[PDB]
């Protein structure tokens, strides 16, 4: 009707003339004006992905976490105080609109984090934008993340409220269900492509939220212009994150859930399950910093803004694919960086 | 061919700047001049969907039901006067072209019936036109919806054989198979808008019947013009919906059929299938999950009545691969969700 | 160009004066030859024999004899329809050197419509076929497959070919477009060549593919005389093979001519299907269906349907829409599934 | 964005007037200027699909076979001798880009190898064009293949680097996860079509490599431009294929693996996965099937060789369902077909 938009499947990225091996690229990224990630990943901010384990090993690795909100401002603050606690590690903290939004910030500043991130379900609300200016007004230095968005129109507005960093995504969380019950959202691979381009041209960068199952589809979103990867599926299955080991029938799992689903909010718009345990963090960063350095040696980009400005994507269709993932084939060995 | 009509797992909505919350938002709507509804949800005419129980409990939740025409005369008769003598409540009765079909229509209305809604396979037909206008002259106050059409033209047409409502639908049914064995059908987000558009013209509203599956198709419905949402499936599983209650596998399962099928057909070619359903409890629980959809999606696009979401409403075409990540994934689902499954 | 197969269409409901009981399925397969309903069965060793064709002529249609037997036994075949009344039946030739001999036999047993059935229609071999055969035989109707283009349409129509059949690639025992990477989706390719024929005044026959009585309308809306079925009529016990049983469900085995056993590189399969009964109630349920879909468009006549029928395109989330969703089916409908 | 890419599945070919058999077709090819094949087919080198067994069957049966590179420069060289003093048979040799690169060469053509391969993940980057130039300028008479690429601008930098041959394809591989885990690549069709489009402009051929499944698959990449292709899947099951026969439910398989999973790169990132594939028997029946649907494909586009096959080939889209049609559909297949399955 007005266009057909596309997500991380419906896409590829075509080879350049390469002049740099994949050992030589690099990962270094800006989150905010003020803030450098060496690797350009974020851990989402649920609880059960991100306390202050995850928080530590993220920022050790080079990436952030962020801590969730679910808790109360006084626990909140102790789990980023345990994160500054070791080290001149980078931290961020989950705020909501709400009533004591203001204390809880309060809190949270006073335990020196570095970023804040406004999250709500629909970021381009009035409750968001005049939250924004209420926080840049007390501490105008401290950095904050609003979101969630998919429209360039959001960007300007959040950017005008004095947003320094916008998070992108409405509906493509794999335990999310919003684009089910509201009908609402837009394909992710389309959403960071016009709200990065928009970002650009303000000067804001936008996060990549939701949808990320390899570390291919990262690279395809960095490629979009997004400055950093937000990941909870990925990071879930991790030992840095909270919740126990379950074994159901010989494997090892762990507890994902939604923070719109019904065991989150103790009309839902998330669900509650189980993923594969995967072992410690280490291991997964490392397959996905490979295989994005890999990315970036095809296309011959040394750091991430020339990845941007000579990305060529191409549509892909459902046979193409089935012919992207490996097939007609009876897997014996399972690989690190692949199912 | 001719186009690419698209159905409601093709598009998505684009969410616009909100100053609304999802608990302020108004879901009034305009069923036909004359009546209006507090919400857009109404239950389809069928044999498994819609009797005086589940007509009571509809009205009482802010929707209408609709009396199926799978019964005697005297019969639906008595099921629209026992929801209009259980306080002051709308009711609405199927009527099909028939010979005695203006009997039928005197029945109800001494009834005192509010509605009536001449439902065909094929609304674009001559029987239901010359209906249409045997019903208007007779009963010039009585309020007609006349279905099913797909078209735009259509919508001309009965609108001009005196209808005051339309209800568009050919194939999207659950339970339908019109488009595998005739080949004939419109997918349903497309006929939806079109009619919707034409009968925006001639101000005559239009109804989506068909096809829903989760609140958020309803949200679409909704946006692409359509005044009222019906659906059958949804509410076939319920407490107030005529069956009994059998055990399948130690789980409890309503049996819901098509009009067009086999089983409908003895009672008095098919183009139905006949199924069961997962018991889903009383009705107001299944309403809530719906309008808290509704409410949300409407929250999403900064709407505060039905009308400023069809002024202000964008979709977006997603692919097969959109549809996927739309939906949850890479994730074994352990806990029961309320509104997905 | 993008082609579409029936599966990605759609008809559009019109404005309609006429019901499904008062449509006429009258057609003209050629000039001379007309059936009370454009339903014929395939020329197959595992579908149509005198059993089949017997019956699909007093239903109103033409079965066609397959060649995979003798030239005595095709010709007894023919005649043990022809004597059963004045029944329409159907011979299938090849290019072959005894082809002459096979195509007077069946016309000495007085066979009315034959059918010369190639993997590729429109080649050197056929159109020779065609030629010879109406130089000797000028009153003897011919139908000529198989083809895909307009172009071969004219080439064949041209040769003196009073009918054409259609089809590369869209039947359910064929690997063609799989060990050749040759075809067309069969939906674009009759309307591409229905068109071409109605300029020619050549009927076109919409052969392979089909699977329900909504997709012959299709096929009819594309401006196909008639349709031609193997796998609907497979299962049936007027097709030959005896009833097999594997693993308590009754099944009869359907095979492609151009699979190994036919033969005896192939580009069909052999496989088993479910046994259906008769055939009378197969196809009471297809002109049914046929009807209810004329109905639908105000089309009182086949050639009515073509003028006036309008197509549109659905996705794969439109496709899974149109089929019975989200409901465990108990009942099995004599006409889905 | 650019425009759709599409894969082999993605289309299909028209038939065009035929005055030809497939008995009386040529299937000839120029694998390069100077290097001529009866049949288009290459065996991939990998150490799970080609070595001299496999090398000796595919130049016997009329096509070739290239040396894989995992093993030393003396095993290399060793195989290679295997294959030239079997009988008057061409060999090819694979190369990578390493300090001992040039070395290994010397050896393979002291060998008396016909054809260099500069296998690498990426074949439009400085080192293959450096390695080209390395090695034209030593060996300024040995046939050199150049790939993987899959863009026409690659296919001009390594042509005018001196390079004979381009091979194309960026994960279409059966056994490959590079678009899954880089997220690059381009659909094999559209990667052949465009680099033998620019080939045919600067006169040097383009092999097709990776994702071919049947025979019908290889016409349409012949058809698109491509001089030959080259398989994995297809012919790592046959017994002239390394590593022994594997049982599984009394069932007799082959192991075919990546040459970027983990298991024959002996910490690292691997770009492709271990498994297990059917035993197909002997080579000569494989070869046997796909070179007669081949020559059926021609037939159809009335193609005598293999030159007149790209001229005169139509190629139309189809979609999801078209591709459900193309496939033997609503049938239990009983017996096993020699090209199906
Ligand atoms: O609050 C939720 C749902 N929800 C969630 C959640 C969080 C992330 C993604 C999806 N849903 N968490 C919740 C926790 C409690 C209650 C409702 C919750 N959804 C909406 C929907 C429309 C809105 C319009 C304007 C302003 C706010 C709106 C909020
Ligand atoms: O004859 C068959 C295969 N075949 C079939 C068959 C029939 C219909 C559809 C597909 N295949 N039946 C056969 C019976 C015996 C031998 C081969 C057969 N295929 C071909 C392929 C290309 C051709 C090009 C020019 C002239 C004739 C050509 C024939
Ligand atoms: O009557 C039914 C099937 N049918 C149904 C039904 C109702 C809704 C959706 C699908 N089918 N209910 C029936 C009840 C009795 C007999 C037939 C019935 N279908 C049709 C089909 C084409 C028509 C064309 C012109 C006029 C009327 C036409 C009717
Ligand atoms: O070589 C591999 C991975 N790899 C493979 C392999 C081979 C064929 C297809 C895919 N991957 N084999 C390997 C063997 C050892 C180590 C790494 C290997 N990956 C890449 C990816 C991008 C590059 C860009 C410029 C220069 C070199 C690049 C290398
Ligand atoms: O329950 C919810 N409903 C909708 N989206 C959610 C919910 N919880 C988390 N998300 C989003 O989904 C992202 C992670 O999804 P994933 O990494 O793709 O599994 C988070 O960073 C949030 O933006
Ligand atoms: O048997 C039938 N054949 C085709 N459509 C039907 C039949 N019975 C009911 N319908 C339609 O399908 C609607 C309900 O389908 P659902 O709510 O989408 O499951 C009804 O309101 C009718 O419009
Ligand atoms: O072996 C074969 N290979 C390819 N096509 C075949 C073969 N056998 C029959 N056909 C075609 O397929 C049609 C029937 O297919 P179906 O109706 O789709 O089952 C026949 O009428 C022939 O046109
Ligand atoms: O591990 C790998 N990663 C990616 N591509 C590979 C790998 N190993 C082999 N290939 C490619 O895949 C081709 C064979 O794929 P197939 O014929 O589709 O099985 C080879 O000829 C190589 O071009």
């Given at each position: 009707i007005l266009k057909t938009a596309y997500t991380f499947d419906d896409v590829l990225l075509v080879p350049n003339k390469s002049?740099?091996?994949?050992?030589?690229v690099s990962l270094k990224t800006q989150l905010t004006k003020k803030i450098q990630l060496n690797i350009p990943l974020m851990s989402a901010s649920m609880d059960t992905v991100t306390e202050s384990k995850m928080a530590i090993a993220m920022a050790r690795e080079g990436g952030i976490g962020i801590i969730h909100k679910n808790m109360t401002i006084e626990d909140q603050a102790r789990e980023v105080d345990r994160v500054k606690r070791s080290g001149g590690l980078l931290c961020g903290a989950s705020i909501g609109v709400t009533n004591d939004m203001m204390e809880r910030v309060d809190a949270v500043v006073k335990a020196k984090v570095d970023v804040i991130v406004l999250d709500t379900?629909?970021?381009?609300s009035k409750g968001v934008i005049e939250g924004v200016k209420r926080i840049k007004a007390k501490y105008p230095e401290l950095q904050v993340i609003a979101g969630n968005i998919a429209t360039p129109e959001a960007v300007r507005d959040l950017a005008e409220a004095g947003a320094d960093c916008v998070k992108v995504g409405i509906?493509?969380?794999?335990?999310?269900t919003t684009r089910i019950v509201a009908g609402v959202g837009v394909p992710q691979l389309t959403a960071v492509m016009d709200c990065a381009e928009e970002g650009k041209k303000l000067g804001i960068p936008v996060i990549a939220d939701?949808?990320?199952?390899?570390?291919g589809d990262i690279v395809k979103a960095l490629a979009a212009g997004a400055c950093a990867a937000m990941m909870g599926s990925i990071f879930?299955?991790?030992?840095?994150?909270?919740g126990a080991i379950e074994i159901y029938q010989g494997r090892s799992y762990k507890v994902y859930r939604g923070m719109g689903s019904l065991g989150a909010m103790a009309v839902p718009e998330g669900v509650e399950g189980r993923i594969a345990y995967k072992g410690h963090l280490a291991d997964t960063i490392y397959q996905l910093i490979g295989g994005i350095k890999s990315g970036m040696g095809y296309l011959g980009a040394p750091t991430l803004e020339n990845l941007y400005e000579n990305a060529n994507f191409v549509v892909q269709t459902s046979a193409g694919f089935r012919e992207s993932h490996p097939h007609d084939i009876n897997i014996t060995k399972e690989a690190p960086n692949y199912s």
């Open positions: 002049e740099v091996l994949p050992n030589e379900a629909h970021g381009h509906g493509p969380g794999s335990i999310c939701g949808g990320l199952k390899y570390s879930a299955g991790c030992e840095e994150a909270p």
